[PDB]
């Protein structure tokens, strides 16, 4: 560790980064160049095994500014991860291992980032998950750091303030946030839009705050040493110059998100002692020094495994890594009329009791969501997490819990406020993580709180999002079967649940919940099929009885999951969907015309009133539905 | 102004509030009771005309905690607004003027609230809009205050931090935020989830901060006097007891959101000197004192109108209140190949030039959204607002600009990050305000930034949301026609625009953009119709040419707006949709099966690559589409 070697190392990172962006003719060179000194120093502090990116006690490194991806990739390559030099030359190209923003399919990447702010909240979540992991397994087995690199953009986003609020409350002294303060954003000078006292902000939220020159290697190093000893979450405010080293582009907003240009890169290389007429060059001293991470990380991981072998926590670690979902005896709700928020809360309790790594919480709505895990305690000693009124940060925190290595998290709010967390739900979907979203108060059935609290379009949003199952159970038995599927699935699930009591259904005639849609009633030479989910299934059963009394044969189909039904073969779909198919749901759900000739939904916003008065207004009654079906 | 009269007034507010919740058997009594002293005092300071709630220079009062609606309604009734005592007795009932959370259809309500945090950001927006209005009209005509009442829940939400950041930057010394600090939320003690140094937080964001007992009338009064003289945005931290006055329920989380109960209310009335055996009683002294707002507000408004009559700004105020959209000469883009982000930016420039009240901005993406209003200056002297990386607060700020009385705002970001502002977009829709949303980078056509930056489900979300038009123009001419409609509509609009160059279209054969979908190509005895929007229309035209060369008659339909097409009569729809209808869009857009037999979309997340490479991967080419259409 001297300035000559650190300068060479930083410059290696710069020029790989600049070269990759240039070859792609696409990407972000400014942040890589401005962060290269910091990352050079940090490489001396980071505990990780490049040959085993799943080591449980590794330091977790998050780049919140995912536009800095070339710098991440350069570092992974140089440190000995499975990412090659040819992969670097395929930056931002179709099917490469080096996409424009980081994806977890690239080994070494801790969490997908790209949408600003998410990373900061993910890093708090990794810090929380580490505290819980230490609670379970001991401080002899879990003692690592969480480092996050973030920029201006991250810290302007509301989710950053939400997550840092929590980091202070929970005294996350394993969390180190490094802010790249370069005074530049896409619109130019940061002062056009931001002039907060950042130190004061973060001190108000229980952080220790350091301020340094982010191009001074000894100051970077001293700050990391102090940060690692902090008794609070720590912020390093690192004043940098965007595109540091890039001559005429230093400090320019033009360096944020376009290639530096061939002549700029030649001049930069020249000034740094690099040969300007080659690219993708890795100097020898820098090669050896970065690659030393392989030997060092193998020995760190070895020492840890020896500690594990001595631990009384081995059998627990094995259960947490290999949960057995098949053994779980769920509640039997057959014939019981219940709100599905209540069936669901009973299931959450059964899960928490069977699965040592199953935990979660609500955004201040535990009592109403029915998500309290009874007699299981509060975080950190227990399992209930009190997120406060921070839907978005909750979901991003829980995305990190799902990535940590030993946890099965749930996030809960009212379905209408799913909108506050949807960007993080999207990241779960993109990553295909096991994170469960619990959304109660699913419809106009909410009643008196009125239209700001009555979902209308949210079912469409979640159905439309890739890599997500959206379950809307009609009763407790459906609610159990939705969970069985959700825990065995390869993608995240949402549970869309009622405030109000729903009527228990009879048993399936043909198919089941695993098929997405199934038959509850089947008639020969059916003239109509009524297809419904959740709270509307009983209406459809009553309506089909009235239509049969009036002389019309009907099928009734329960559709707890649209996405699973989309995967069924034509023969199955043809057996269910006979005659003229009518979809019925208390939502604005045009996607139902994939399967239905007519859809009886809600096209407007809701109304404040008693639940029964609001459903009648919106047409949800047997007499009205039957008149619709009979076109008169 | 003495303690006897203020006590009686506060208690009047309490017991109306408690009585309304009790009669409804639904609603939130805790906040009303805890805020009743503050609001009693504030009534002495508020400048407003109950008989003219549209007076432009009135103080704007926002209840961010919209669950406190009964207190708002009580105050509006007592002060002389058009809300009667019978309306109070119809709280939370279907079709009443007193819905569970406040709606702007109730005169006196400044902005709809209910989703927490929105109100705080709306109040910053009213403060910003007031500064701009003062810039335009003068400090002789605009000099009012903006008061916001908020709770724990509001200040935990990220949008609050975003909006307050801006309030400090812009030195909004017309903004007074009153925080009801009662240490209680739905999950119990606030310290379970929040322990920030609130004073330090807000000082970090450029506020002056006062701290008071919110049940001490002289302290409330002194703080309001000091706040009205502040040179910064001001926060009053008012320590209150939830359900103050309600005996055994004082300080209980159980008082947040359920009725207090008949016996509690009797004891409370008894302790306050009220007759316990009646309800909805308004004591005489309190009646006269609150109603004095009518005479006082008539004289305030009169004095203002005299100032206006003397002003050189009369003719401008009249133009701002009565814009003439019909006069506007838009750019002629016929035959010009352009990205629709670029056509759109040219239109934004034309609008800003013709409409003195048209302004807006981007969430740090002006250069990429193409939203800069050239030579029009920065806010406050000019029209370009630099929101920073604060999508949600931007939209909530702009909702308030749209409500202010003289402004036509736009908000802009990448379409993928519409998800960060969707809850405020929803409030625009609910209110039916004229607020325009500009969303560029609409598809996998984004290319290299990859799947976190490539919209897939967002078109579905916006189509599904009530009271919103979603325009996705295929060319600049469509882009102009979308604006003409948007400015004359009664609801908000979104503009979904491309990064990449689109090909100019020929003129309509039958119908036009105003019909939502129209014919570009029409063939007798058409076997197929290709229905598309935006970037996919050219693919469909090329494909229909190939299908005609292969001997199949085709129609081609451009669908710039799904919602307007849904409103067309059957005859129009039947003329367009001939044969087997195929919908084609670079989105996961199942709603297209409302009109299409087959849909050729994208069901997965995107990929990082060159735009041409990504569209080919996802099937968007003439050879692939034609093979799909021909089922082989
Ligand atoms: C939620 C969100 N909104 C907008 C963007 C587009 N974007 C990328 S970086 C950036 C701002 C510049 O940010 P900064 O963090 O200062 O990065 P630097 O250029 O200094 O590296 C923006 C607005 C995004 N990725 N995420
Ligand atoms: C965005 C959002 N998330 C959740 C809710 C549900 N909700 C209403 S009030 C409240 C919390 C209690 O808030 P506070 O502001 O402390 O109100 P108080 O009970 O003290 O009046 C919650 C979580 C909401 N209205 N908006
Ligand atoms: O503003 C949101 C409100 O607090 C809700 O009114 C309330 O918490 C819901 O109560 P319940 O569990 O009966 O639906
Ligand atoms: O992380 C988001 C990025 O900053 C975008 O890559 C960039 O700003 C887009 O540039 P362009 O105007 O060419 O699409
Ligand atoms: Ca920056
Ligand atoms: Ca509170």
- What domains, with CATH codes, occur in chain B? 2-318 (3.40.50.970), 319-514 (3.40.50.970), 515-632 (3.40.50.920)
Cα separation of B419 and A427, whole Å? 12
Helix (H) or strand (E) segment spanning residue B481: helix B476-488
* Residue B67, annotated as binding a ligand: yes
Q: Tell me, using a 6 A CB cutoff, whether residue A609 lines ligand 4.
A: no
Q: Of the candidates B565, B558, B557, B421, which has an alpha carbon nearest to the alpha carbon of residue B494? A: B421
- Please work out, in degrees rounded to the nearest 5, the angle formed at the alpha carbon of residue A445 by the alpha carbons of A482 and A609: 170
Q: Do the Cβ atoms of A198 and B204 come within 8 Å?
A: yes
Whether residue A374 contacts residue A352, with contact meaning beta carbons closer than 8 Å, is answered with no
Chain A residue with CA closest to B192: the answer is A386
Helix or strand holding residue B176 (H, E):
strand B175-181
The Cα–Cα gap between A530 and A21 comes to 55
Beta strands in B441-503 (DSSP E): 469-471, 493-496
β-strand pairing of B358-362 with B408-414: parallel
* C-alpha distances in Å from residue B478, one per residue of A416, B111, B470, B472, B517: 33, 33, 13, 9, 11
Structure tokens at A383: 């399992």
C-alpha of A271 from chain center: 42
Contacts 24+ apart (CB under 8 A), B139-144: B140/B307, B140/B311, B141/B56, B141/B57, B141/B304, B141/B307, B141/B308, B141/B311, B141/B313, B141/B317, B142/B56, B142/B57, B143/B57, B143/B174, B144/B47, B144/B57, B144/B58, B144/B59, B144/B60, B144/B174
Buried b (16+ CB within 10 A) or exposed e, B261-291: eeebbebbbeebebebeebeebbeebeebbb
Helices (H) and strands (E) in chain B, counts: 23, 18
Q: Which residues 6+ apart lie within 8 Å of A126 measured at CB?
A: A60, A62, A110, A111, A146, A400, A403, A404
Nearest ligand to the C-alpha atom of residue B186? 2
Torsion on CA atoms A506, A511, A514, A517, rounded to nearest 10: -80
Using the structure block, give the residue that is written with the tokens 């890739």.
A466
| Whether A112 contacts A102, CB under 8 Å | yes
- CA distance, residue A314 to nearest chain B CA (Å): 32
Q: State yes or no: A153 annotated in a binding site.
A: yes
**CA torsion through residues A26, A31, A33, A39, sign:** negative
Cα A144 to ligand 1 centroid, rounded to whole Å: 29
Q: How far apart are CA B586 and CA B496, in angstroms?
A: 12
Supply B444's token pair: 């996998």
Regarding beta strands B518-521 and B554-558, do their DSSP bridges make them parallel or antiparallel, or are they unpaired? antiparallel
Where does residue B319 rank: exposed (0-12), middle (13-18), buried (19+ CB within 10 A)?
middle
Q: Which residues pair with A210 in a beta bridge?
A: A236
* Residues facing A414 on adjacent strands: A440
Write out the two tokens for A318: 């094995």
Task: Write out the two tokens for B142.
Answer: 């605009």
Q: What's the CA gap between B470 and B422, in Å, rounded?
A: 13
CA-based torsion, B387, A66, A411, A454: positive or negative: positive
Residues with CB under 6 A from ligand 2: A 364-365, 389, 417, 420; B 30-31, 65, 67, 114-116, 151-154, 182, 184-186, 242, 256
Angle between helices A118-137 and A422-431 (to 10 degrees): 70
- Asked if the Cβ–Cβ distance from A466 to B457 is below 8 Å, we say yes
Query: Nearest-5° angle of CA B522, CA B528, CA B534?
Result: 70
d(CA B399, CA B128): 12
Distance CA A294, CA A52 (A): 10
Instruction: Give the resolution value in Å.
Output: 1.6
Computed on alpha carbons and rounded to an integer, the radius of gyration of chain B in Å comes to 27
User: CA B216, CA A612: separation in Å to the nearest integer?
Assistant: 43
Spatial strand order in the sheet of A598-600: A518-521, A554-558, A528-532, A580-584, A598-600
Catalytic site includes residue A391: yes
Residue A84's CB is within 10 A of a number of other CB atoms, namely 12
Q: How are beta strands B60-63 and A580-584 bridged, if at all? A: unpaired
Which entry of A391, A522, A563, A585 is annotated as an active-site residue?
A391
Query: How far, in Å, from the CA of A65 to the mean position of ligand 5?
Result: 10
- Are residues A449 and B101, on separate chains, in Cβ contact within 8 Å? yes
> E strand or H helix at B368, and its extent?
helix B366-369
Q: Experimentally, how was this structure solved?
A: X-ray
């Amino acid at each position: 560790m001297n300035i000559q070697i650190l300068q060479e190392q930083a410059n290696t990172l710069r020029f790989l980064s600049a070269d990759m962006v240039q070859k792609a003719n696409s990407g972000h060179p400014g942040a890589p160049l401005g962060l290269a000194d910091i990352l050079s120093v940090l490489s001396y502090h980071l505990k990780h095994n490049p040959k085993n990116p799943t080591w449980l006690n590794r330091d977790r490194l998050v780049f919140s500014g995912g536009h800095a991806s070339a710098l991440l990739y350069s570092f992974l390559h140089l440190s000995g991860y499975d990412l090659s030099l040819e992969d670097l030359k395929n930056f931002r190209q179709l099917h490469s291992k080096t996409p424009g923003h980081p994806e977890i399919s690239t080994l070494g990447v801790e969490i997908a980032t790209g949408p600003l702010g998410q990373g900061v909240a993910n890093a708090v979540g990794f810090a929380m998950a580490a505290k819980k992991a230490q609670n379970l397994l001991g401080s002899d087995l879990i003692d690592h750091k969480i480092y996050c690199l973030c920029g201006d953009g991250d810290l302007q986003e509301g989710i950053s303030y939400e997550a840092c609020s929590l980091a202070g409350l929970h005294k996350l002294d394993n969390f180190i946030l490094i802010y790249d303060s370069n005074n530049i954003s896409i619109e130019g000078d940061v002062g056009l839009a931001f002039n907060e006292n950042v130190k004061m902000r973060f001190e108000a939220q229980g952080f220790e705050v350091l301020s340094i020159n982010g191009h001074d290697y000894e100051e970077i190093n001293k700050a990391l040493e102090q940060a690692k000893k902090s008794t609070k979450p720590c912020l390093i405010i690192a004043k940098t110059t965007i595109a540091k080293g890039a001559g005429e582009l230093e400090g320019s907003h033009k360096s944020h998100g376009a290639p530096l240009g061939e002549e700029v890169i030649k001049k930069a290389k020249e000034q740094a002692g690099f040969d300007p007429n080659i690219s993708f060059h890795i100097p020898q001293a820098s090669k050896i020094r970065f690659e030393s991470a392989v030997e060092l990380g193998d020995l760190e991981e070895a020492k840890w495994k020896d500690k594990l072998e001595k631990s009384a926590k081995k059998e627990l670690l094995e259960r947490l890594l290999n949960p057995d979902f098949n053994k779980i005896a769920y509640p039997d709700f057959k014939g019981k009329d219940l709100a599905t928020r209540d069936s669901n809360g009973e299931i959450l309790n059964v899960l928490a009791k069977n699965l040592e790594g199953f935990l979660g919480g609500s955004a201040d709505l535990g009592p109403s969501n029915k998500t309290e895990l009874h007699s299981m305690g509060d975080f950190v000693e227990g399992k209930n997490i009190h997120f406060g009124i921070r839907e978005h940060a909750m979901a991003a925190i829980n995305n990190a819990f799902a990535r940590y290595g030993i946890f099965l998290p749930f996030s809960a709010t009212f379905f209408i406020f799913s909108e506050y967390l949807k960007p993080a739900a999207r990241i779960a979907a993109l990553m295909k993580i096991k994170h469960f979203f619990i959304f109660t108060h699913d419809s106009i059935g909410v009643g008196e709180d009125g239209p700001t609290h009555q979902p209308i379009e949210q079912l469409s949003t979640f159905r439309a999002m890739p890599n997500f199952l959206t379950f809307r159970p009609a009763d407790g038995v459906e609610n159990v079967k939705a969970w069985q599927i959700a825990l065995n699935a390869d993608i995240p699930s949402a549970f869309v649940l009622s405030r109000q009591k729903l009527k228990a259904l009879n048993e399936p005639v043909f198919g089941d919940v695993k098929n997405g849609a199934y038959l509850l009633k089947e008639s020969k030479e059916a003239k109509f099929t009524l297809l419904a989910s959740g709270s509307e299934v009983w209406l459809c059963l009553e309506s089909a009885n009235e239509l049969e009394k009036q002389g019309f044969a009907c099928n009734v189909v329960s559709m707890p999951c649209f996405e699973l039904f989309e995967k069924q073969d034509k023969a199955y779909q043809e057996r269910l969907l006979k005659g003229e198919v009518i979809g019925v749901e208390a939502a604005h759900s045009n996607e139902l015309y994939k399967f239905c000739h007519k859809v009886y939904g809600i096209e407007s916003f809701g109304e404040s009133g008693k639940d029964k008065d609001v459903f009648e207004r919106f047409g949800f009654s047997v007499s009205k539905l039957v008149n619709f079906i009979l076109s008169k």
